[PDB]
């Protein structure tokens, strides 16, 4: 294989990247985005507050953009994010009671129905855990709601999209611990009950030489309760400045994870939350950490790039 793509198709599984809409205007970012993926997920495009800036008052310029560049290219459109704690508009936060409910269940509506036909899955509720077990305890959905509001998503979600994968999304799930085995409970007790849900996400947003070594144990016990597992926003994160021992570590890293997901028949794919450095979002959320993404931010291949094409 020449690229991750063809390395992915070949392997019958994805390889996407988080899109911003407005670097498909940069040559050398268009370039890399057409040619090494086969996946596409909106970094921010889709999100609650660039999808209702205001209550009823819906946006989707930014997420059309993705969606279209989606089609236009050939890969396929993941959906990222419709109940999440972050990111959410005042507006929403104001809300109490029935009044919330029904603003959730609408925003979900209107978004799932809006993209139905074009996002192939999407992560209907993200986050919903806090590490250490249990639930998140700084979410305005767990706090107005209650353990109640992911089922009412994901049946709003099935109900708007018939046949879109719907997934729970999660970061620090990667290995089996306190925060997996919460989020491993809801996954088997939905399943029970028969409450709309087909794939897990796990983020993956690891920090180099930690790579959790019972990855695929892990990956293989959700699946192995009925439903697709997928990593979505893989990056691994470095001290910066980054140098040679770093980057063959996190090389090693990356082979590991895209490992792991090819050892499980149920893993759809590895999608990388970004392409270069030079807009990783991790530096300005992770003081002194970095250079956690395939591409350095002069668009070099990085030793990352040949790990990943030698697992696939
Ligand atoms: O770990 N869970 C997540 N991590 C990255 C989130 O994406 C970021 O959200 C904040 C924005 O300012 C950044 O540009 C964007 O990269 C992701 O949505 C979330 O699931």
New binding site residues.
Partial sequence: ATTLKEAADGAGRDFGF?L?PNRLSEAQYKAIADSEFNLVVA??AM?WDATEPSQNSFSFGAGDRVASYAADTGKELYG??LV?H??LPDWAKNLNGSAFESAMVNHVTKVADHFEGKVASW?VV??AFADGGGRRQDSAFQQKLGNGYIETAFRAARAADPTAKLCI???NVEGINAKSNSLYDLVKDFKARGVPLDCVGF?S?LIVGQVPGDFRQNLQRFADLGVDVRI??LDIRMRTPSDATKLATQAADYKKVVQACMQVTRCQGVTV??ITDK???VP??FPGEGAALVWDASYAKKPAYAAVMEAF
């Fill in positions: 988080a911003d970094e921010n999100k990222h994010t999440w972050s990111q992560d993200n986050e999304n999660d970061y983020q947003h979505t926003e939350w970004g807009y990783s979002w300005d959320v």
